DNA sequence: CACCCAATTTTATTCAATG
DNA sequence: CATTGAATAAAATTGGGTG
């Protein structure tokens, strides 16, 4: 329910801003609503990802996102740590937008990746941003 | 534990065709 | 003139392995 609450909140935002994105503004009511549902559900799923997400935990740092910087340790006289190189300091892998793209092709079969990049992905990215911007949208819920 | 690197995937962009 | 899509290169990630 908290998940459904968050998704509906995102969906209201998405409907509000949908007019600004050529790939969705043109879509018919029901198809448009389903495309927005896909985009919001995937954006929220990505926002909620962590090292506890099955399969996501970085293999090299085991989720800490940290690793000793041996060159700096040797030249600075103390143990210095850097961001883990494999996960770029996150500790876990993200869900690429390509997953939402493939999900959306089930509703827009002729959607190509370049046209997705130009005309639909910006809405997806905006929904991810909105997840980060809204405190009420919880990453642990 | 942190690294290496080929293989693979993601991503935006070039260039030519469309309309 | 804007838009699109095949192709492509840069960047990100994965798989298999090591010192
Ligand atoms: Zn890591």
Per domain, the residue ranges of chain A are: 1-133
What was the resolution (in A) of this experimentally determined structure? 2.2
Cα separation, A47 vs A83, in Å, equals: 21
Q: Within 7 A of a protein CB, which nucleotides of strand B?
A: 1-4, 9-14
The experimental technique used to determine this model is X-ray
**Strand B closer than 7 A to residue A50 Cβ:** no
CA distance A111 to A100: 12
Query: A1-133: what CATH class?
Result: mainly alpha
Rounded Cα gap, residues A117 and A101, in angstroms = 9
Rounded to whole angstroms, the distance from the CA of residue A91 to the C1' of nucleotide B5 is 21
The residues placing their C-beta within 5 Å of ligand 1, an ion, are A 58, 60-61, 84, 86-87
CA–CA separation, A87 and A101 (whole Å): 23
For chain A, give percent helix, strand, coil, nearest 5: 55, 5, 40
Specify which residues A107 forms β-bridges with: none
């Amino acid at each position: 329910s908290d998940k459904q609450k968050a998704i509906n909140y995102l969906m209201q935002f998405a409907h509000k801003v949908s007019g600004k994105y050529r790939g969705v503004a043109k879509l018919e009511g029901n198809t448009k609503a389903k495309v927005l549902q896909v985009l919001a559900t995937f954006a929220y799923a990505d926002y909620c990802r962590s090292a506890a997400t099955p399969g996501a935990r970085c293999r090299d740092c085991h989720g800490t996102g940290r690793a000793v910087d041996i060159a700096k340790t040797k030249l600075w006289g103390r143990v210095v740590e850097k961001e883990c190189g494999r996960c770029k300091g996150v500790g876990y892998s993200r869900m690429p937008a390509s997953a939402a793209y493939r999900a959306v092709t089930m509703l827009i079969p002729n959607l190509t990746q370049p046209t997705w990049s130009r005309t639909v992905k910006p809405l997806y990215d905006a929904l991810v941003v909105q997840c980060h911007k809204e405190e009420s949208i919880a990453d642990n819920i």
